[PDB]
Every structure is written in structure tokens, then in C-alpha cells.
Amino acid sequence: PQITLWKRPLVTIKIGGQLKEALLDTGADDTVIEEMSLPGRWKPKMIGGIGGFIKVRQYDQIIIEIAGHKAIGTVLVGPTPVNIIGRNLLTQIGATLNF
Amino acid sequence: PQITLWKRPLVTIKIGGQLKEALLDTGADDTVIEEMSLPGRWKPKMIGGIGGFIKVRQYDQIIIEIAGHKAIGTVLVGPTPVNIIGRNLLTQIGATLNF
Numbered sequence: 001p002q003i004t005l006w007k008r009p010l011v012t013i014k015i016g017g018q019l020k021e022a023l024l025d026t027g028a029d030d031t032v033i034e035e036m037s038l039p040g041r042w043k044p045k046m047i048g049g050i051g052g053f054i055k056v057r058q059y060d061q062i063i064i065e066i067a068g069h070k071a072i073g074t075v076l077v078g079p080t081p082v083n084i085i086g087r088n089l090l091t092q093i094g095a096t097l098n099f
Numbered sequence: 100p101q102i103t104l105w106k107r108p109l110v111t112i113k114i115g116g117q118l119k120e121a122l123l124d125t126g127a128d129d130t131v132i133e134e135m136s137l138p139g140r141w142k143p144k145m146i147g148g149i150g151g152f153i154k155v156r157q158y159d160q161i162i163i164e165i166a167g168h169k170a171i172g173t174v175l176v177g178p179t180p181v182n183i184i185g186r187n188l189l190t191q192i193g194a195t196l197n198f
């Protein structure tokens with residue numbers, strides 16, 4: 001699809017068996033999801049943005065379905081105010097910015 | 100152009116006669132630039148990023164070139180990890196996300 005930027009680029013994702021709404025976010029290196037359980041190993045990480053840093057759990061090799069496209073990669077889980085699909089998964093679905 | 104996302108989508112902007120680097124950021128409603136001098140009056144705004152809220156200075160109707168495209172619109176000045184071009188100016192330059 002071509003997604004307009006008149007509105008926030010929110011899509012439906014499926015992760016860990018759960019449906020969520022998330023932003024397609026070219027400004028985020030990595031994907032960050034609000035608190036949820038994921039299977040397997042994780043390690044702690046600090047990620048920062050406007051307002052400072054939050055602590056997250058880094059889970060590697062997690063499958064997401066993003067607007068119907070499957071992608072695998074790292075997912076950071078923690079107290080983000082919005083679910084963010086970052087570049088590590090945007091690349092895998094072939095997303096580009098065009099103007 | 101068509102910009103893939105394997106790297107950060109950094110571009111050159113020109114504001115106040117000065118070249119700066121900025122990140123094309125579809126996850127931001129607004130454009131936020133590091134401390135600099137801009138003409139005119141400003142208004143207060145709070146923005147809630149990933150780590151909490153910051154105060155910024157809102158300047159409206161500012162001339163800014165983005166990757167060689169001319170825009171005129173609102174620029175928020177305050178402490179951000181990187182200059183970010185949000186949807187208010189991505190729409191002015193005709194940007195969309197595509198997959």
C-alpha cells in the first residue's frame with residue numbers, strides 16, 4: 001500500500017499471538033512494544049529519545065506480522081507510550097519513504 | 100527519491116541560512132530541532148517522547164528546506180537526541196510510506 005502521512009501511520013500487527021496497533025516509524029532504529037510476555041531469552045537494554053531513557057527487555061528472533069506481512073527480528077519490550085515498528089522490521093517488509 | 104530504511108533516513112535541512120542534518124521521522128507528528136535562534140514570537144508546547152515530557156519553543160511559519168524541498172511551517176526548538184522532521188513537514192514535501 002501507499003500510506004499517507006496526513007495521519008499517524010498506524011497499522012495492525014500480530015505479535016506473540018496478540019493483535020496490537022503500532023506506528024510505522026522511520027525515526028526508530030528498533031521496534032519497541034508495550035509491556036507483554038514473549039517466549040525465550042532476553043537481556044536488558046536502555047533506549048533513549050525525547051524525555052530521556054527507558055529500560056526495556058531485548059528479545060531476539062521474534063516474528064511479527066505487520067499489516068499482513070511477516071518479518072522476524074529483535075523486539076524491545078518496555079514502558080513505551082506507543083507501539084513502534086522500527087527500521088529493523090520496516091526493511092524486512094520492503095517499506096520505503098518516497099517523495 | 101525512494102529511501103530505503105537499512106540506514107537512518109538522514110537528510111540535509113537548511114534553516115536560518117544554516118545547513119543541519121535531520122532524521123525523517125514518520126513516528127513524530129511535529130518537527131523538533133536542537134537549540135538555535137529563530138525569528139519572531141514563540142509559544143509553549145509540551146511533547147511526550149519515549150522517555151517523558153519536555154518543554155519546547157514553538158515557532159510558526161518558519162522557512163525550512165528539507166532534502167532540497169521547500170517547506171514553511173512549525174518548528175519546535177528544544178532538547179532532542181537528533182533533529183527530527185515530523186509529519187507536519189513530511190506532508191509538505193509530499194512524503195508517503197510505501198510497501
Ligand SMILES: Cc1coc(CN(C)C(=O)c2cccc(C(=O)N[C@@H](Cc3ccccc3)[C@H](O)CN(CC(C)C)S(=O)(=O)c3ccc(CO)cc3)c2)n1
Binds near residue numbers: 023086128129
Ligand atoms: C503516536 C502518538 C501518540 O501521541 C503522539 C504525539 N507525539 C508525542 C508526537 O507525535 C511526537 C512529537 C514529536 C516527537 C515525537 C517522537 O519522539 N516520536 C518517536 C516515537 C514516539 C511517538 C509517540 C510517543 C513516544 C515516541 C520517534 O518517532 C522515535 N524515537 C526516536 C527519535 C526521537 C530519534 S523514540 O521513540 O525515542 C525511539 C524509538 C526506538 C528506539 C530503539 O531504537 C529508541 C528511541 C513524537 N503520537
Ligand SMILES: [Cl-]
Binds near residue numbers: 072073074088
Ligand atoms: Cl533485528
Ligand SMILES: [Cl-]
Binds near residue numbers: 094103
Ligand atoms: Cl531493499
Ligand SMILES: [Cl-]
Binds near residue numbers: 171172173187
Ligand atoms: Cl506546520
Ligand code: NA
Binds near residue numbers: 040041060061
Ligand atoms: Na529469542
Ligand code: NA
Binds near residue numbers: 138140158159160161
Ligand atoms: Na513565527
